[PDB]
Amino acid sequence: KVTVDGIEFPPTITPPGSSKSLTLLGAGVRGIEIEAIQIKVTAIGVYAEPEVIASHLQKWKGKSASELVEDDGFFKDLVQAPVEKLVKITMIKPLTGSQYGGAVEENIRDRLKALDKYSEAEEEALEEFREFFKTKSFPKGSVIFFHWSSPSTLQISVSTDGSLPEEAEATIENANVAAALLDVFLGKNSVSPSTKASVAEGISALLM
Ligand SMILES: [Cl-]
């Protein structure tokens, strides 16, 4: 397990609507700082299938956690790897659905605009993202499951109490939004350098 801010991230999770078990790569915290005030917003865990994802990362074999974490190409390879992925979010700071969703939407939208990959299709995908989160509430301990069921298919499920949903609650089909959301966590300018640091540890260990 990796414990973050008192929150357990277990070694394995089965995505909602899925039967396949995914394994923990790493976990960390998303914190914000302004005028020296630090606030922990969420904890983040990243899951995939160990040997399947090791199969796409053999060029990083033998490398240490220190080596991997400072190589941007490493995280790029991980975002791009066409394998099943899951990101679990556990809420630390209480947020409304609109609050949480609006910020991740903005992050994705800004990333796509920077790449000149924000067009009508992506706009509609992010409107669906918005529609989904608008009806939700995120008290402390609530959870979000972002599941990459295909490289271009994002499933979202939530629970207010930390239970594991039985099914994907929303499905968004758009390759650019799906990759951009991964980059929110694993890209340059990640919301969580700690999560990246932990994933580097996990994959370094995994590539023996
Ligand atoms: Cl988050």
Tab-separated table of C-alpha atoms and ligand atoms in Angstrom:
chain	number	residue	atom	x	y	z
A	1	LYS	CA	0.000	0.000	0.000
A	2	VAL	CA	0.898	3.662	-0.186
A	3	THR	CA	-0.593	5.859	2.509
A	4	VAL	CA	-1.091	9.527	1.676
A	5	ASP	CA	-2.154	12.091	4.294
A	6	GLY	CA	-3.657	9.218	6.286
A	7	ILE	CA	-5.497	7.878	3.237
A	8	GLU	CA	-4.780	4.286	2.200
A	9	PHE	CA	-4.231	3.475	-1.443
A	10	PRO	CA	-4.454	-0.306	-1.665
A	11	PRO	CA	-2.129	-2.433	-3.798
A	12	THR	CA	-4.953	-3.306	-6.209
A	13	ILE	CA	-8.345	-1.892	-7.364
A	14	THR	CA	-10.926	-3.257	-9.782
A	15	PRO	CA	-12.324	-0.338	-11.800
A	16	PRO	CA	-16.085	0.153	-11.649
A	17	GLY	CA	-17.824	-1.934	-14.271
A	18	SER	CA	-14.647	-3.947	-14.637
A	19	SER	CA	-13.496	-7.385	-13.511
A	20	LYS	CA	-9.770	-6.891	-14.163
A	21	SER	CA	-7.655	-5.937	-11.132
A	22	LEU	CA	-5.161	-3.077	-11.571
A	23	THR	CA	-2.058	-2.558	-9.440
A	24	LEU	CA	-0.791	0.530	-7.617
A	25	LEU	CA	2.046	2.406	-9.320
A	26	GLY	CA	2.115	5.281	-6.902
A	27	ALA	CA	0.236	7.847	-4.949
A	28	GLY	CA	0.538	11.360	-3.768
A	29	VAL	CA	-1.141	14.563	-2.769
A	30	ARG	CA	-2.481	17.512	-4.740
A	31	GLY	CA	-1.751	20.684	-2.876
A	32	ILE	CA	-2.104	24.335	-3.760
A	33	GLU	CA	-0.047	27.276	-2.543
A	34	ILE	CA	-0.793	30.981	-2.648
A	35	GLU	CA	0.905	33.651	-0.508
A	36	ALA	CA	2.638	30.897	1.469
A	37	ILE	CA	-0.700	29.278	2.402
A	38	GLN	CA	-0.679	25.530	1.653
A	39	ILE	CA	-3.846	23.555	1.323
A	40	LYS	CA	-4.167	19.841	0.582
A	41	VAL	CA	-7.026	19.373	-1.891
A	42	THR	CA	-6.951	15.672	-2.827
A	43	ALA	CA	-4.947	12.472	-2.718
A	44	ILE	CA	-4.254	10.709	-5.995
A	45	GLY	CA	-3.462	7.119	-6.818
A	46	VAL	CA	-2.400	5.696	-10.162
A	47	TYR	CA	-3.091	2.089	-11.200
A	48	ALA	CA	-2.306	-0.088	-14.261
A	49	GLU	CA	-1.504	-3.733	-15.092
A	50	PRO	CA	2.176	-4.272	-14.036
A	51	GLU	CA	3.460	-6.608	-16.745
A	52	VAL	CA	1.386	-5.090	-19.532
A	53	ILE	CA	2.751	-1.635	-18.763
A	54	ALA	CA	6.266	-2.956	-18.142
A	55	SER	CA	6.051	-4.341	-21.683
A	56	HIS	CA	5.774	-0.770	-23.046
A	57	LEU	CA	8.548	0.677	-20.870
A	58	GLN	CA	11.450	-1.712	-21.419
A	59	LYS	CA	13.650	1.157	-22.604
A	60	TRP	CA	13.511	2.392	-18.974
A	61	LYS	CA	14.557	-0.955	-17.493
A	62	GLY	CA	17.304	-0.897	-14.887
A	63	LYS	CA	16.860	2.822	-14.262
A	64	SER	CA	16.486	4.076	-10.682
A	65	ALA	CA	13.596	6.112	-9.260
A	66	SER	CA	15.854	9.193	-9.255
A	67	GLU	CA	16.769	8.659	-12.899
A	68	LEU	CA	13.196	8.057	-14.072
A	69	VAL	CA	11.605	10.959	-12.208
A	70	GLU	CA	13.820	13.577	-13.836
A	71	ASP	CA	13.281	12.163	-17.381
A	72	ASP	CA	10.247	13.888	-18.956
A	73	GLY	CA	10.355	11.296	-21.692
A	74	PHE	CA	9.582	8.665	-19.090
A	75	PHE	CA	6.301	10.235	-18.002
A	76	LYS	CA	5.462	10.955	-21.633
A	77	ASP	CA	5.905	7.254	-22.417
A	78	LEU	CA	3.603	6.387	-19.529
A	79	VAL	CA	0.815	8.778	-20.574
A	80	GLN	CA	1.059	7.486	-24.133
A	81	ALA	CA	1.266	3.786	-23.277
A	82	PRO	CA	-1.927	2.258	-24.840
A	83	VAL	CA	-2.785	0.258	-21.729
A	84	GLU	CA	-5.595	0.252	-19.176
A	85	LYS	CA	-5.157	2.902	-16.458
A	86	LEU	CA	-7.022	4.069	-13.408
A	87	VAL	CA	-6.669	7.209	-11.335
A	88	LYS	CA	-8.365	7.244	-7.958
A	89	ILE	CA	-9.001	10.594	-6.349
A	90	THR	CA	-9.789	10.872	-2.648
A	91	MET	CA	-11.130	14.185	-1.496
A	92	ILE	CA	-9.362	15.893	1.407
A	93	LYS	CA	-10.740	19.416	1.075
A	94	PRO	CA	-14.565	19.454	0.774
A	95	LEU	CA	-15.662	20.607	-2.673
A	96	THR	CA	-18.851	20.958	-4.635
A	97	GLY	CA	-19.130	19.049	-7.886
A	98	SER	CA	-18.877	22.303	-9.829
A	99	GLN	CA	-15.767	23.318	-7.940
A	100	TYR	CA	-13.873	20.135	-8.533
A	101	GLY	CA	-15.041	19.619	-12.052
A	102	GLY	CA	-14.539	23.210	-13.124
A	103	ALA	CA	-10.904	23.160	-12.084
A	104	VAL	CA	-10.019	19.914	-13.840
A	105	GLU	CA	-11.955	21.066	-16.926
A	106	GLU	CA	-9.967	24.319	-16.936
A	107	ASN	CA	-6.718	22.405	-16.598
A	108	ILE	CA	-7.560	20.131	-19.489
A	109	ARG	CA	-8.869	23.005	-21.656
A	110	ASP	CA	-5.764	25.112	-21.065
A	111	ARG	CA	-3.524	22.163	-21.919
A	112	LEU	CA	-5.428	21.510	-25.147
A	113	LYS	CA	-5.383	25.168	-26.180
A	114	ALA	CA	-1.606	25.244	-25.603
A	115	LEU	CA	-1.305	22.284	-28.004
A	116	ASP	CA	-3.821	23.746	-30.539
A	117	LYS	CA	-5.869	20.628	-29.959
A	118	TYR	CA	-8.978	22.316	-28.539
A	119	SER	CA	-11.725	22.109	-31.146
A	120	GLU	CA	-15.458	21.404	-31.189
A	121	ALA	CA	-15.098	17.702	-30.331
A	122	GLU	CA	-13.050	18.531	-27.243
A	123	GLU	CA	-15.423	21.305	-26.294
A	124	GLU	CA	-18.307	18.839	-26.301
A	125	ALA	CA	-16.324	16.264	-24.315
A	126	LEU	CA	-15.600	18.878	-21.672
A	127	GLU	CA	-19.291	19.927	-21.643
A	128	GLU	CA	-20.105	16.281	-20.809
A	129	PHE	CA	-17.427	16.373	-18.095
A	130	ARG	CA	-19.153	19.482	-16.739
A	131	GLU	CA	-22.630	18.023	-16.893
A	132	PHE	CA	-21.474	14.996	-14.947
A	133	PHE	CA	-19.776	16.824	-12.082
A	134	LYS	CA	-22.506	19.453	-11.724
A	135	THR	CA	-24.876	17.019	-9.975
A	136	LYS	CA	-22.226	15.687	-7.592
A	137	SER	CA	-20.941	16.619	-4.126
A	138	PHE	CA	-17.472	15.934	-2.723
A	139	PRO	CA	-17.331	15.943	1.061
A	140	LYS	CA	-14.091	14.932	2.786
A	141	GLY	CA	-13.467	11.296	1.954
A	142	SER	CA	-15.523	11.196	-1.215
A	143	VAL	CA	-13.894	9.438	-4.200
A	144	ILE	CA	-13.549	9.752	-7.959
A	145	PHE	CA	-12.564	6.984	-10.291
A	146	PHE	CA	-11.143	8.004	-13.649
A	147	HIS	CA	-10.781	4.899	-15.754
A	148	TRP	CA	-9.080	4.758	-19.156
A	149	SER	CA	-10.998	1.843	-20.687
A	150	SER	CA	-9.412	2.674	-24.014
A	151	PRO	CA	-6.753	5.195	-25.014
A	152	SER	CA	-9.653	7.468	-26.106
A	153	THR	CA	-12.359	6.372	-23.667
A	154	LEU	CA	-12.699	7.856	-20.212
A	155	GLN	CA	-15.065	6.415	-17.630
A	156	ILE	CA	-15.929	8.442	-14.549
A	157	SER	CA	-17.576	7.228	-11.363
A	158	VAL	CA	-17.928	8.752	-7.914
A	159	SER	CA	-19.096	8.005	-4.387
A	160	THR	CA	-19.683	10.331	-1.497
A	161	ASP	CA	-18.690	7.830	1.216
A	162	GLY	CA	-15.698	5.970	-0.283
A	163	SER	CA	-17.671	3.020	-1.590
A	164	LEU	CA	-16.709	1.482	-4.879
A	165	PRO	CA	-19.314	2.078	-7.563
A	166	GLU	CA	-20.662	-0.923	-9.418
A	167	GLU	CA	-20.610	0.700	-12.840
A	168	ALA	CA	-19.045	3.513	-14.794
A	169	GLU	CA	-21.407	6.470	-14.349
A	170	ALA	CA	-20.262	8.523	-17.359
A	171	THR	CA	-18.294	7.711	-20.503
A	172	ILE	CA	-16.506	10.383	-22.540
A	173	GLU	CA	-15.036	9.499	-25.926
A	174	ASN	CA	-12.275	11.887	-27.019
A	175	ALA	CA	-8.627	10.968	-27.394
A	176	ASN	CA	-7.302	14.491	-26.727
A	177	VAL	CA	-9.269	15.023	-23.519
A	178	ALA	CA	-8.347	11.547	-22.277
A	179	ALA	CA	-4.623	12.230	-22.776
A	180	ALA	CA	-4.874	15.696	-21.351
A	181	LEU	CA	-6.456	14.426	-18.181
A	182	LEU	CA	-3.608	11.958	-17.732
A	183	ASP	CA	-1.195	14.850	-18.274
A	184	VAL	CA	-2.943	16.766	-15.502
A	185	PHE	CA	-1.455	14.114	-13.187
A	186	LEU	CA	1.628	12.821	-14.979
A	187	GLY	CA	2.590	15.624	-17.361
A	188	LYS	CA	4.965	18.506	-16.997
A	189	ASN	CA	3.389	21.032	-14.613
A	190	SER	CA	1.470	18.217	-12.903
A	191	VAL	CA	-0.929	19.074	-10.125
A	192	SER	CA	1.055	16.518	-8.040
A	193	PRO	CA	4.853	16.196	-8.198
A	194	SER	CA	4.484	13.849	-5.188
A	195	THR	CA	2.334	11.458	-7.145
A	196	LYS	CA	4.853	11.522	-9.969
A	197	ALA	CA	7.670	10.887	-7.464
A	198	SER	CA	5.811	7.892	-6.096
A	199	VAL	CA	4.960	6.483	-9.524
A	200	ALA	CA	8.642	6.730	-10.481
A	201	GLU	CA	9.452	4.694	-7.395
A	202	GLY	CA	6.813	2.164	-8.278
A	203	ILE	CA	7.773	1.707	-11.919
A	204	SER	CA	11.504	1.658	-11.036
A	205	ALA	CA	10.721	-1.177	-8.608
A	206	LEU	CA	8.556	-2.844	-11.224
A	207	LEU	CA	11.278	-2.770	-13.872
A	208	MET	CA	13.397	-4.596	-11.230
B	1	CL	CL	-7.399	15.848	-8.251
